[PDB]
Ligand binder design. Structure first.
Ligand SMILES: [Cl-]
Ligand SMILES: [Cl-]
Ligand SMILES: [Cl-]
Ligand SMILES: [Cl-]
Ligand SMILES: [Cl-]
Ligand SMILES: [Cl-]
Ligand code: NA
Length: 129
Protein backbone atom coordinates (compact mmCIF):
# COMPACT_ATOMS: atom_id res chain seq x y z
CA UNK A 1 0.00 0.00 0.00
CA UNK A 2 1.22 3.45 -0.90
CA UNK A 3 0.02 5.84 1.80
CA UNK A 4 -0.85 9.44 1.31
CA UNK A 5 1.27 11.87 3.36
CA UNK A 6 -1.55 12.92 5.67
CA UNK A 7 -3.09 9.43 5.62
CA UNK A 8 0.15 8.04 7.03
CA UNK A 9 0.46 10.82 9.57
CA UNK A 10 -3.04 9.93 10.73
CA UNK A 11 -2.28 6.21 10.96
CA UNK A 12 0.97 6.85 12.80
CA UNK A 13 -0.79 9.15 15.24
CA UNK A 14 -3.51 6.61 15.94
CA UNK A 15 -0.86 3.98 16.65
CA UNK A 16 0.80 6.22 19.22
CA UNK A 17 3.92 7.49 17.43
CA UNK A 18 3.30 11.27 17.85
CA UNK A 19 5.92 12.26 20.43
CA UNK A 20 6.85 8.63 21.20
CA UNK A 21 10.26 8.80 22.99
CA UNK A 22 9.93 12.53 22.32
CA UNK A 23 9.81 12.37 18.54
CA UNK A 24 7.04 14.50 17.05
CA UNK A 25 4.88 13.06 14.32
CA UNK A 26 6.67 15.00 11.57
CA UNK A 27 9.87 13.12 12.36
CA UNK A 28 8.14 9.80 11.74
CA UNK A 29 6.48 10.95 8.54
CA UNK A 30 9.78 12.44 7.29
CA UNK A 31 11.61 9.18 8.07
CA UNK A 32 8.96 7.15 6.25
CA UNK A 33 9.16 9.43 3.21
CA UNK A 34 12.84 8.90 2.68
CA UNK A 35 12.98 5.30 3.81
CA UNK A 36 10.10 4.00 1.68
CA UNK A 37 8.26 6.88 -0.11
CA UNK A 38 5.31 5.80 2.05
CA UNK A 39 5.17 2.37 0.44
CA UNK A 40 4.52 -0.52 2.84
CA UNK A 41 5.91 -3.03 0.27
CA UNK A 42 9.35 -1.37 0.00
CA UNK A 43 12.32 -3.79 0.42
CA UNK A 44 16.00 -3.09 0.02
CA UNK A 45 19.02 -5.36 0.32
CA UNK A 46 21.87 -4.13 2.47
CA UNK A 47 25.59 -4.69 1.78
CA UNK A 48 25.86 -7.08 4.74
CA UNK A 49 23.20 -9.37 3.28
CA UNK A 50 20.36 -8.26 5.51
CA UNK A 51 17.23 -6.69 4.07
CA UNK A 52 15.19 -3.59 5.04
CA UNK A 53 11.37 -3.97 5.01
CA UNK A 54 8.30 -1.71 4.96
CA UNK A 55 7.44 1.94 5.50
CA UNK A 56 10.29 2.41 7.95
CA UNK A 57 12.78 -0.02 6.36
CA UNK A 58 13.31 -2.20 9.43
CA UNK A 59 16.26 -4.53 9.15
CA UNK A 60 16.45 -8.31 9.28
CA UNK A 61 19.84 -8.43 11.04
CA UNK A 62 18.30 -7.37 14.33
CA UNK A 63 14.56 -6.90 14.21
CA UNK A 64 12.66 -9.40 12.09
CA UNK A 65 13.10 -12.84 10.61
CA UNK A 66 13.33 -13.33 6.88
CA UNK A 67 15.04 -16.73 6.97
CA UNK A 68 18.04 -15.58 4.97
CA UNK A 69 20.10 -13.32 7.23
CA UNK A 70 22.86 -15.29 8.95
CA UNK A 71 23.67 -14.75 12.56
CA UNK A 72 20.83 -12.33 12.84
CA UNK A 73 18.24 -11.79 15.50
CA UNK A 74 14.49 -11.24 15.44
CA UNK A 75 14.05 -8.88 18.38
CA UNK A 76 10.54 -7.78 17.31
CA UNK A 77 9.47 -11.42 17.10
CA UNK A 78 7.91 -11.08 13.63
CA UNK A 79 8.41 -12.36 10.10
CA UNK A 80 9.81 -9.51 8.04
CA UNK A 81 6.91 -9.97 5.63
CA UNK A 82 4.55 -8.61 8.34
CA UNK A 83 6.35 -5.31 7.87
CA UNK A 84 5.02 -5.12 4.30
CA UNK A 85 1.34 -5.28 5.22
CA UNK A 86 -1.13 -2.49 4.43
CA UNK A 87 -1.78 -2.58 8.19
CA UNK A 88 1.15 -0.69 9.72
CA UNK A 89 0.68 -2.16 13.20
CA UNK A 90 3.71 -4.45 13.05
CA UNK A 91 5.94 -1.71 11.65
CA UNK A 92 4.87 0.73 14.35
CA UNK A 93 5.28 -1.71 17.22
CA UNK A 94 8.70 -2.70 16.01
CA UNK A 95 9.68 0.94 15.41
CA UNK A 96 8.78 1.67 19.03
CA UNK A 97 11.23 -0.99 20.11
CA UNK A 98 13.98 0.34 17.79
CA UNK A 99 13.67 3.95 18.88
CA UNK A 100 13.78 2.83 22.51
CA UNK A 101 17.11 1.02 21.85
CA UNK A 102 19.48 3.82 22.91
CA UNK A 103 20.26 6.01 19.89
CA UNK A 104 16.70 7.17 19.30
CA UNK A 105 15.82 7.86 15.70
CA UNK A 106 19.49 7.94 14.71
CA UNK A 107 18.84 4.23 14.17
CA UNK A 108 17.36 5.35 10.85
CA UNK A 109 20.36 6.69 8.93
CA UNK A 110 17.99 8.49 6.52
CA UNK A 111 16.32 10.22 9.45
CA UNK A 112 19.75 11.39 10.68
CA UNK A 113 20.82 12.52 7.21
CA UNK A 114 17.62 14.02 5.87
CA UNK A 115 15.19 14.79 8.69
CA UNK A 116 17.14 15.49 11.87
CA UNK A 117 17.39 19.21 12.53
CA UNK A 118 15.06 20.18 9.71
CA UNK A 119 11.54 21.65 9.87
CA UNK A 120 9.89 18.22 10.16
CA UNK A 121 6.56 19.82 11.08
CA UNK A 122 6.23 20.64 7.37
CA UNK A 123 5.53 16.94 6.87
CA UNK A 124 2.19 17.08 8.71
CA UNK A 125 1.23 20.57 7.63
CA UNK A 126 -2.35 20.78 6.40
CA UNK A 127 -3.19 17.35 7.76
CA UNK A 128 -6.42 16.75 9.57
CA UNK A 129 -5.09 15.19 12.76
CL1 LIG B 1 5.12 13.64 -0.09
CL1 LIG C 1 6.12 17.57 13.84
CL1 LIG D 1 17.65 -15.48 9.10
CL1 LIG E 1 9.24 -15.91 11.16
CL1 LIG F 1 -2.69 0.97 9.31
CL1 LIG G 1 20.88 8.91 3.99
NA1 NA H 1 16.87 -11.68 11.39
Amino acid sequence: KVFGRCELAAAMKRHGLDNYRGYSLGNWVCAAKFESNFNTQATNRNTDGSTDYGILQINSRWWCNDGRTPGSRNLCNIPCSALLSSDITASVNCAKKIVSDGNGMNAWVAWRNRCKGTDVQAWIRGCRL
